[PDB]
Amino acid sequence: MANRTVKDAHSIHGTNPQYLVEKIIRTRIYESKYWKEECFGLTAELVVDKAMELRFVGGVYGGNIKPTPFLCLTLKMLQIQPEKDIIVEFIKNEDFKYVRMLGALYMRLTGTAIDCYKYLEPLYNDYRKIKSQNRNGEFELMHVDEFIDELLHSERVCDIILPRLQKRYVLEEAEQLEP
Question: Domain ranges in the chain?
Answer without folding.
Answer: 1-179
